[PDB]
Scaffold this active site. Structure first.
Site, short mmCIF file in Angstrom:
data_model
loop_
_atom_site.label_atom_id
_atom_site.label_comp_id
_atom_site.label_asym_id
_atom_site.label_seq_id
_atom_site.Cartn_x
_atom_site.Cartn_y
_atom_site.Cartn_z
N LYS A 1 0.92 -1.27 -0.02
CA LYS A 1 -0.05 0.06 -0.47
C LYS A 1 0.51 1.16 0.33
CE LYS A 1 -4.52 -1.74 2.17
NZ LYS A 1 -3.43 -2.91 2.18
N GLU B 1 -10.69 6.92 4.36
CA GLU B 1 -10.98 5.93 4.13
C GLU B 1 -10.20 4.05 4.91
OE1 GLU B 1 -12.36 3.75 1.44
OE2 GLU B 1 -12.63 5.54 1.57
N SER C 1 2.19 -9.56 -0.43
CA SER C 1 1.36 -8.45 -0.31
C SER C 1 2.03 -7.23 0.90
CB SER C 1 0.48 -7.65 -0.74
OG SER C 1 -0.35 -8.98 0.17
#
Ligand SMILES: O=C(NCCOP(=O)(O)O)c1ccc(OC(F)(F)F)cc1
Ligand SMILES: O=C(NCCOP(=O)(O)O)c1ccc(OC(F)(F)F)cc1
Ligand SMILES: *Cc1c(COP(=O)(O)O)cnc(C)c1O
Ligand SMILES: *Cc1c(COP(=O)(O)O)cnc(C)c1O
Ligand code: NA
Ligand code: NA
Lengths: 394, 251, 394, 251
Positions: free
Chosen positions: A86, A108, A376
C-alpha cells in the site's frame, strides 16, 4: 470528455454525483501531467528508494518446493516501509495532491492498513490527514487506530449505518465534494471511479517491473506465472501490469473463498458475483437478487472488499488473466507453512496467493514451473487471529 | 407529460411548485403511504420519492436514517413499486419522481427498470450517481418509456454542462442551491426546481423570485418523521403544517 | 592460546568453565576460516541481499530538523527482515553453525526479539532451534513466543531462579556444554566470551559500511557523528566499526537512563556501573557493593541488559567513542516525534539514539552538524507500551 | 598445607578422601553451621563450600535452589566469611575449599579476596568460570596467600591441558567424572578428586580403585537438605547416614 479511457471493456467508468466530476477531471489531468514530468518521477523514485526501501527483494524459496519441480520466488512487499505494498501508491497520490496545490488528505479504512499508510505518507509530506472509519472497525482495529493518531492523522469515527467502511467510504466522499479544492481523496485500491483504477495501477507498477528485472537476472527468463491475492486489486495489478504484454506469462489473481464459495460466505465477486454499479464504477460485486450490496467475508480483513477493480474484470473477460479462490483454511495452512519453512510470516492476505501457488505445486509435483507470488505484506498483525483459531481447535 | 401540465397550470396561476421528498417505506409501508397522502393533501405539487439502497454515497444523515428505518421494516424495491402503483391509482395527476442509485436501476436491466416505472405511473427518475457523462443508457431508456430523465445542475456548472443538462433533461432541471436559471432558460432547459437546504418558507419564495419554477425539500420533511416516530398522528399533523406553510410561500 | 585477541584493552576475555573452552576455540577457528572464505562471504551476502533486504535505506529526515542547522539521516535497520538489525548476525552465525557441521541452534531471549531472529534464521537454513526463556518473560512476551513456535523453534520455559533471562542464559550454556558437537549457541549481542563480541561485530559491520557509502554518495563527506543505542552493543558496534579509523567521525553510544541515573533504576553500566566478571567477560556491569549482579531497568525491554560489550568499554576508555544516557521520558518523546514528523514508528530501543540526536540539535540549533542515527528497529511492537503510558497520564 | 597432610595421612591408611559440598548459608546461617558440623562428625575428610552468587552459569537445579534458599535467608559473602572463620576455629585440620564465581573474587580486588581467605583459614579456591587460560591473576594471588588454586580437568582434556592443570593446580586436581589419572600422576599433578554425579558408595570405591585420591559429592548432599526443610533434626540425621556410608566406601 476525459484524457484517458475510463473503461476496461465494459468495466469501470465514473459513476459519481455530478458535483464530484470536476474533482475527478482535475485529478486525471494532474496525473497525466505528473506522468510526463521527469521531476515528478524523480521525486517519487526518491521517496520509494530512500524512504520506503525499494527495490524490494525477490526471494527464492527452496525449502517449500523441495521434492517438486516448482521453483518459487516471493516478491517481498512485506519488506516495504509500513509492511505492505500500500505504501507505494499512497506516496504517489500524496505527491499528486501536492502537485494540485492541496495540503489536506481524506481517506477511509476498514482493516486499518490503508489508514496507516495514508497517515505515514501525510506525515512525511506535511499533509493534514483525516481518516473516516466505521465505529465498529475503530473498535476491532485499536492497534491501527493508535498508529494513525501517533502519526498525526485525525481519525473520525462515523456511526451512521452499519458503521462498516461503506459508511465512511461515503462520509469521505461527502467531505471531498465540498473540500476538493484543498483536499485530495486518497482511494485505497485499484477500484472506484476513473481515474483511480488507472492511477493506483501506475503507482504500483514498480512491483511487476522490479520482479521482471529480478527474475531475468536470476533465472534468465520470465515466470510461467505471477500470482497475487485480490481484495480491491491494487497489489495484483501492480504485479501484473508490466507482464500484460508478455503473453507467455500467466496472471493469476486469488480472491478469498472464506468458508467456501458454496456457503455464500466469501469475498470472490469477480468469479462468483454479479456485475453492478457501485463505488463509482461498473464492476462485479457481492449483491442480493434485487441489487442491494451484499457483505463479503474472509478470515483476512484486508480482502473483505465487496467488489473488485474494473481492470481485473476486464483481463478476466478476455482471458488474459485467470482468477481463482482460496479458503480461510487453505490460507491458514499457507501462513503456517511459510513461517516454518522459510522463516517469513506472511500477511493472511498474501497467504491466499501463496496457498494457490502451493496448490499448483502439490497437485502436479512433476510439472516444471517457475512461479512468483506477490508477498503483499507481512503477517505480524495476523498473529493473534491465527493464534485464536488454532487454540479454538485445540 | 404530468410535469408539463403541472408547470403550465402553475404558470397560469403565477405560482411556484413545492416538491417534498421522502423515502418510500419510512418508517413503514403503512405509515409511509399515510405520510405521502398527507403531503399531497397539504399542498404538494409533485413528489420526489427515494427507494432504500444499501450503499448510497450521496445522502446525508437525516436521509441515511430514513433508509435504515425502511430496511428495518423489510422494505424492498419490489414493495416500493407496489406502493408507487397504489399512490398513482389514488392521485392521477400529481407528478411522481424517483430518486435512485444506479445499481437498483441497472440490476435487472436498465430497460426493464424504466418499463416498470412506466407501468406503475412514475413520471421521472433522477439517478444520483450517474453524471451526464455516463447518462446515455439511462436517459435513452427513460425516454423510450416516456419517463423524464432528471439531471442535477451544480452551482459551479460551466457552460458545457449547462448545455448538456438543458439538452438531456426533461420534466425539470434539478438546480442545487440564478444567472444559471437565466442561462438554463436560454438553452430551453426543463423548468428549474431548486433543492438542497430548503427548509423554510422564505427559501421557497426566494427560489421563485430568482426565476426557478419551484423548490424541493427533503431533510426538513424527513426530520419531522424521525422526531415523531412514537406519535404517528402527531407526525402527520406536523407534516401537514410544514407542507402547507411551504406551499403557501410559493403562491 | 587463541587465533585472535580475546581482549579490547582490559575488557573481554573467555571467563567460562573449562568444559566450554573447546567450544569457544572451535568457534573462533571456524570464524577465522569463514572470514577468509570467498564462498562463505558470497553465501552470507546472498542471504543478506535476497532474504533480509540489504542494503537498507539511509533516510534524510528534513521535517524533524526544520529551523536548525542539523542534517539528520536514519540508517533504516527497521526495514530489515524481522524489523530489527538482529537479523544480520543471526544469519551469519547460522551459516557458521552449518560450516561446523552442526544442525542445531541453542539460544535464549528476554524481550523475545533475539529468539524470533534465531527462529527465523534456523527455519530458513534447516536448523533445529531450541530457545530457553524465563517463565516470567514467556508470560510478558506472548506475541514473540508464538512467533518463535510458528517458525518451528522449540521454546523451553525455565522456571529456575527469578526466571529472568539470566536463568535461561545459563540454561542455554549448560545445554551447550554437553551438545556443542552438534549444536551452536547463538549469542544475541556483542558481548559474552570471546569470540562472540568479535563475531557479532563483524556480522553487523555492514550497517556502518553501507552508511559510509550512502552518506558519501548523498553528502560527499562523512558524518560528524553516528549515534546508536546500547543494550548489549551489537547494533552500535555494527554502525561504529567501519568508522573507527575515521577519527573525525564521532561515535556516540546511548545507554538507557530509565527513570533517571540518580534513581538507580536504569541500564547504563558502561558509564554508571562497575567493572566485573560475568557472562564470560570482564566488562562494566550493574552490581551491588558486594558483587551480586544488579537488575537493570528501561522502558525498552531490549536495552534491559545488565552489562555491555567489552569493545564499547574499551572504545570509551581510550576516548574514541563517547557514551551518554537517555531517560524513558526522553525516549518516549523521540518516539512520538518521529511518528508525527517522518511517518516512521521507531523501536523504543532506537528511540533512545534518536532522542540524543534531537538533544544535540535542540541544545545548539545553530551548530552545523551532519548526524546519522542507527534506527535499529521498528516500533510496532511498542505501540501498546507507549499507549498505556500515555493513557495513564491522561 | 592441610591438603598435603590429609592426603599423606589417608595414604598411610590406604583410603580415599570423601569430600561433601554444600552452599554456605543454606537453608540458613544457623542450620548451615549445624549441617557442616554433622558432615565433619560423620566422616568428611575435607569440605567444598559454595558462596551464594546471583548469576552462576555453572550449577544445576539442586544447587541453584540452594543459592535461592541462602539468598532468601539474606546470606552475603561477608556472612559467609564469618561462617568460615567459625568453622575453622572449631575444626583446625580439615581442609576447607571454596567454590567461587569470578565476580565475587574480582569484586573488591583479587588480592584482597585471597588475603581474606587466608585470614579465615580457607585452604583452596576453585573459581568455576575461570579456565586455565584466564587463571594467571587468580592462581598468583592464591599462591601469594598460601591458598591452593584448584582447577577442573575435563574427561576429554588434551595433553596440553593436562600439563597446564598439573603445573598450575595445588591441593587437589578436580577431575570431572582414569588414564588421565595416570597421566596426571605422570605430570606430578595434585592428587585427583573425582566429582560430578557421585551419589552412591560404589562410585566412591570405584573412584579410589581407578587411582583417584578421593571423591566429591554435592547434589546428593544438598538434595537431602531440600527434602527435609521442614524437619531440621531429620535433615541432620539423614546427612549423617549418607556421609558415613560414603566415607565407609573410601576405606
Ligand atoms: O432530492 C434530494 N434531496 C432533496 C432535498 O435536499 P435536502 O432538503 O437538503 O434533504 C437528493 C437529490 C440527489 C442526491 O444525491 C446527490 F447529492 F448526490 F446529488 C441526494 C438527495
Ligand atoms: O564441586 C562442585 N560440584 C560438586 C558435586 O557435583 P554434584 O555431585 O554433581 O553436584 C562444582 C564444581 C564446579 C562447578 O562449575 C562447573 F560446572 F562449571 F565446573 C559446579 C559444581
Ligand atoms: C490492503 C492489502 C491487500 C488487499 O488490497 P489489494 O488492493 O487487493 O492489493 C493485500 N495484501 C496486503 C498485505 C494488504 O495490506
Ligand atoms: C536487540 C535490539 C537492540 C539492543 O541490542 P544491541 O545488541 O545493543 O544492539 C536495540 N534495538 C533493537 C531494535 C533491538 O531489537
Ligand atoms: Na473483492
Ligand atoms: Na546494557
Amino acid at each position: 470528455t476525459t484524457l484517458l479511457n475510463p473503461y476496461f471493456g465494459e468495466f469501470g467508468g465514473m459513476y459519481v454525483p455530478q458535483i464530484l466530476m470536476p474533482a475527478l477531471n482535475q485529478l486525471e489531468e494532474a496525473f497525466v501531467r505528473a506522468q510526463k514530468d521527469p521531476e515528478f518521477q524523480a521525486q517519487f523514485a526518491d521517496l520509494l528508494k530512500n524512504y520506503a526501501g525499494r527495490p524490494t527483494a525477490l526471494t527464492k524459496c527452496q525449502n517449500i518446493t523441495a521434492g517438486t519441480r516448482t521453483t518459487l520466488y516471493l516478491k517481498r512487499e512485506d519488506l516495504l516501509h509500513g509492511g505492505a505494498h500500500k505504501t507505494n501508491q499512497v506516496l504517489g497520490q500524496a505527491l499528486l495532491a501536492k502537485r494540485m496545490g492541496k495540503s489536506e488528505i481524506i481517506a477511509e479504512t476498514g482493516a486499518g492498513q490503508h489508514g496507516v499508510a495514508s497517515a505515514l505518507a501525510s506525515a512525511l509530506l506535511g499533509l493534514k490527514c483525516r481518516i473516516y472509519m466505521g465505529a465498529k472497525d475503530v473498535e476491532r482495529q485499536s492497534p491501527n487506530v493508535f498508529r494513525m493518531r501517533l502519526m498525526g492523522a485525525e481519525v473520525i469515527p462515523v456511526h451512521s449505518g452499519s458503521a462498516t467502511l461503506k459508511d465512511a467510504c461515503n462520509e469521505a466522499l461527502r467531505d471531498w465534494s465540498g473540500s476538493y479544492e484543498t483536499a485530495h481523496y486518497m482511494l485505497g485500491t485499484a477500484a472506484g471511479p476513473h481515474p483511480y483504477p488507472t492511477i493506483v495501477r501506475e503507482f504500483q507498477r514498480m512491483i511487476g517491473e522490479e520482479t521482471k528485472a529480478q527474475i531475468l537476472d536470476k533465472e534468465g527468463r520470465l515466470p510461467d506465472a505471477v500470482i497475487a491475492c485480490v481484495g480491491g486489486g491494487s497489489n495484483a495489478i501492480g504485479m501484473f501490469a508490466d507482464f500484460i504484454n508478455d503473453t507467455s506469462v500467466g496472471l493469476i489473481g486469488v480472491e478469498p473463498g472464506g468458508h467456501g464459495i458454496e456457503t455464500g460466505e466469501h469475498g470472490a465477486p469477480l468469479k462468483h458475483g454479479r456485475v453492478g454499479i457501485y463505488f463509482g464504477m461498473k464492476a462485479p460485486m457481492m449483491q442480493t437478487a434485487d441489487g442491494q450490496i451484499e457483505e463479503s467475508y474472509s478470515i483476512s480483513a484486508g480482502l473483505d472488499f465487496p467488489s473488485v477493480g474494473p481492470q481485473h474484470a476486464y483481463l478476466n473477460s478476455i482471458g488474459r488473466a485467470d482468477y481463482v479462490s482460496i479458503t480461510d483454511d487453505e490460507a491458514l495452512e499457507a501462513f503456517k507453512t511459510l513461517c516454518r519453512h522459510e522463516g517469513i510470516i506472511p500477511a493472511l492476505e498474501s497467504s491466499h496467493a501463496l496457498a494457490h501457488a502451493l496448490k499448483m505445486m502439490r497437485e502436479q509435483p512433476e510439472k516444471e514451473q517457475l512461479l512468483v507470488v506477490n508477498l503483499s505484506g507481512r503477517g505480524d498483525k495476523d498473529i493473534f487471529t491465527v493464534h485464536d483459531i488454532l487454540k479454538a481447535r485445540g | 407529460e404530468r410535469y408539463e401540465n403541472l408547470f403550465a397550470q402553475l404558470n397560469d396561476r403565477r405560482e411556484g411548485a413545492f416538491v417534498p421528498f421522502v423515502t418510500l417505506g419510512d418508517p413503514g409501508i403503512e405509515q409511509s403511504l399515510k405520510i405521502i397522502d398527507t403531503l399531497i393533501d397539504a399542498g404538494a405539487d409533485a413528489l420526489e420519492l427515494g427507494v432504500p439502497f444499501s450503499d448510497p454515497l450521496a445522502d446525508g444523515p437525516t436521509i441515511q436514517n430514513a433508509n435504515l428505518r425502511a430496511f428495518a421494516a423489510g422494505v424492498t424495491p419490489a414493495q416500493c413499486f407496489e406502493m408507487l402503483a397504489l399512490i398513482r391509482e389514488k392521485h392521477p395527476t400529481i407528478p411522481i419522481g424517483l430518486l435512485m442509485y444506479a445499481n437498483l436501476v441497472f440490476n435487472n436491466g436498465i430497460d426493464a427498470f424504466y418499463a416498470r416505472c412506466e407501468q406503475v405511473g412514475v413520471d421521472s427518475v433522477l439517478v444520483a450517481d450517474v453524471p451526464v457523462e455516463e447518462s446515455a443508457p439511462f436517459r435513452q431508456a427513460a425516454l423510450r418509456h416516456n419517463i423524464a430523465p432528471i439531471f442535477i445542475c451544480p452551482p459551479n456548472a460551466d457552460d458545457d454542462l449547462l448545455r448538456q443538462v438543458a439538452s438531456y433533461g426533461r420534466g425539470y432541471t434539478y438546480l442545487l442551491s440564478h444567472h444559471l436559471i437565466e442561462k438554463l432558460k436560454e438553452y430551453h432547459a426543463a423548468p428549474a426546481l431548486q433543492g438542497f437546504g430548503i427548509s423554510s418558507p422564505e427559501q421557497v419564495s426566494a427560489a421563485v423570485r430568482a426565476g426557478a419554477a419551484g423548490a424541493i425539500s427533503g431533510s426538513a420533511i424527513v426530520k419531522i418523521i424521525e422526531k415523531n416516530l412514537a406519535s404517528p398522528k402527531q407526525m402527520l399533523a406536523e407534516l401537514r403544517s410544514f407542507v402547507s406553510a411551504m406551499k403557501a410561500a410559493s403562491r
